[PDB]
């Protein structure tokens, strides 16, 4: 299927790591220190040693996705047209999955996980039922869903990345052990240091251990595909890359309507080219009195995106595709905070009950004592209720 | 000489097409997007041909800023029609970034944020350093320090390459302007992290001082080329042999009492030309105080230079590479340079041209590095 070949590109690039980085981080800094007058080399004696350790580093980071993607193959069988080889933007989502493993499986990045769950599971906890059924658009690796599940909600998680899925299936179902992997997820980062050693920081994953999910327990599941596409609404949503009217997703969507309690976007609301489509599907998917909790900031993915897609109407006499547009901007649409809650409020049928501005919280952030790596983001938080 | 005219022609000609451009670049696909959802989404968003409107108005006056500056320069400089290299996308957004730039130095809203430098900066000089002192700023920007300094007193030589910023330069130092006599829209080529959308619109006057007690001078040129030492530093692209080069550099030795690096000593592929730099233009006794982020310009960058030596080759040198830590500078000038380290505070929180409004939630900033250390 296509599916398979995208898996395919992604399990090769899991095995690629360790010579891409090399090539990308190491050898023209080894080149560098090759070329500058000697006079300046002793002016950094240790260099090579340093080097050195990068290129363990590089080496250990190589288990970890290799690892990752023998675990896949355990449960793949491709075909020979499947196999198709990477790209360079693969090889780059590789790389930076280091930075979302250490955000989303290690104990030094809790607090950073704490911005939003000091703020939501006191309000899950006392106001709205356990268990309930919850869904997590864009959810990563899928930490959160462990949180949530484990207080006992059924939990739903919805991802169109396959880096993201590969190392989400890893991490939940391979019966890791706490601290069982030692990873190095800053080296691809040259720039802050306090103290260089800082950069070949060794980091434990995960900081935790596993845990059933049980049936009436609190479970988690997973739509592999476009938000949209799985839970939007079945009528007046404009037909795009990421809303199809295969009958598959016409169905998903069909038994998506009113089907969850809570709907938690995390570093999410800003992915899309349509913010409008993600309010109506949060609309769609939430029953009456059910609750959309939103943290983030408001960093828009397509701001600078000059390209163009295609997009269609649905005939409703004939239910055939209608209405081409093949000049559809992905930019655009970059609201505010306070339009995203005023058309929620005015047009969707919201109540607010919770909001909060100008949160500071990183994004697999360094937290060493003397961390000056970048601050993090100004992040919203909300909570609006269905009715 | 005749690069260096086709350069600052090009430039201007970046200042000239500010309007297009923006109208091309953040305006155009957004009515696109507008007209291209359906009518029910329109309904979702009732004010936004009005904020595009406005956006186009805003647009409309940065250009009439940008050809201001522009025509200034145009009053020193004739260049033929074909002789004019046209502007790429690169000249065209560092000329956006430019609105960022005169924001943060010559608007009133941003005084918290150069008060990071400042508040720690002038108490120093005041109380331990020689009235009328002679002060270099590297990658002075539009030149805000060399004003603030040179009130102060003391005699300051600013230094940059970039043409827009020399330009804008020339335009906030030497034409008449009187304080807060312009009008510009400094954050409309930013799309997120807005609370509310006006403010992306927020208007802002400069300048905030006049310009017109020290002198003030610009070397235009790199760095290392107009003050590096004459003798065992590598050929590059930010190093010449030229006898112009010579001499200047042979002047330069132990020719300043500061050197004040201030979002500077990260922007070069390799910081120890920068550190050569700093010891060999100071005096014995001559003070560097550094701020700013360790934000190395070069660390993605794959592409490789050439540099050679003569007595009086290699074409592989890398970009990347050199990305030190603060202990490790530090440590370097201290170790190597004969210097003694006298002022240091790390993570220091500091923006950088930062929407500064009631309900900002603009980036934060920087976490900056701040050291004095002094030369012996
Ligand atoms: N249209 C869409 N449908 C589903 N997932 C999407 C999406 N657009 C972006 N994503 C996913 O949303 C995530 C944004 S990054 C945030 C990941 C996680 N929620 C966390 O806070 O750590 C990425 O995993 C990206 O692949
Ligand atoms: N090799 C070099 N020689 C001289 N100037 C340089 C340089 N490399 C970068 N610069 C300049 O250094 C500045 C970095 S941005 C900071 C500008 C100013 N000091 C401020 O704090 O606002 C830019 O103006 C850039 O053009
Ligand atoms: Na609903």
């Known amino acids: 299927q296509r599916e398979n070949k995208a898996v395919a590109r992604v399990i090769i690039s899991f095995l690629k790591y360790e010579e891409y980085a090399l090539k990308e981080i190491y050898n023209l800094r080894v080149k560098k220190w090759a070329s500058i007058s000697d006079r300046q080399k002793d002016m950094v004696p240790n260099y090579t040693k340093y080097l050195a350790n990068l290129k363990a580093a590089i080496i250990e980071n190589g288990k970890f996705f290799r690892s990752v993607a023998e675990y896949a193959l355990q449960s793949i069988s491709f075909e020979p047209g499947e196999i198709v080889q990477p ?75 396959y880096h993201m899925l590969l190392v989400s299936q890893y991490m939940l179902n391979a019966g890791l052990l706490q601290n069982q992997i030692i990873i190095y997820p800053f080296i691809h980062c040259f720039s802050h240091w306090k103290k260089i050693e800082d950069q070949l920081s060794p980091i434990k994953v995960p900081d935790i251990e596993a845990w059933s999910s049980n049936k009436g327990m609190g479970s988690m599941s997973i739509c592999a595909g476009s938000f949209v596409d799985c839970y939007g609404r079945n009528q007046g949503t404009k037909i795009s890359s990421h809303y199809t009217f295969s009958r598959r997703m016409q169905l998903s969507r069909a038994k998506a309507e009113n089907s969850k ?92 009950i919770r909001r909060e501005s100008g949160i500071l919280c990183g994004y697999g952030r360094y937290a060493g004592p003397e961390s000056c790596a970048m601050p993090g983001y100004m992040c919203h938080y909300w909570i609006l209720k269905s009715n």
């Open 87 to 161: 790209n360079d933007l693969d090889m780059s989502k590789t790389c930076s999955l280091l930075t979302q493993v250490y955000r989303e499986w290690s104990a030094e990045a809790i607090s950073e996980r704490n911005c939003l769950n000091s703020r939501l599971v006191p309000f899950l906890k006392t106001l709205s039922p356990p268990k309930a059924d919850i869904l997590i658009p864009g959810c990563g690796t899928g930490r959160l869903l462990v949180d949530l599940s484990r207080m006992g909600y059924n939990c739903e998680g919805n991802e169109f990345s």
């Open 261 to 352: 309690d809570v709907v938690v976007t995390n570093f999410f609301i800003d992915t899309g080219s349509n913010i409008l489509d993600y309010l109506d599907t949060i609309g769609h998917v939430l029953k009456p009195g059910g609750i959309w909790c939103n943290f983030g900031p408001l960093l828009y993915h397509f701001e600078n995106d000059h390209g163009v897609e295609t997009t269609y109407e649905v005939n409703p006499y004939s239910g055939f595709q209608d209405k081409i547009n093949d000049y559809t901007p992905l930019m655009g649409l970059e609201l505010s905070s306070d339009d995203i809650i005023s058309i929620a409020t005015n047009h969707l049928d919201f109540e607010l």
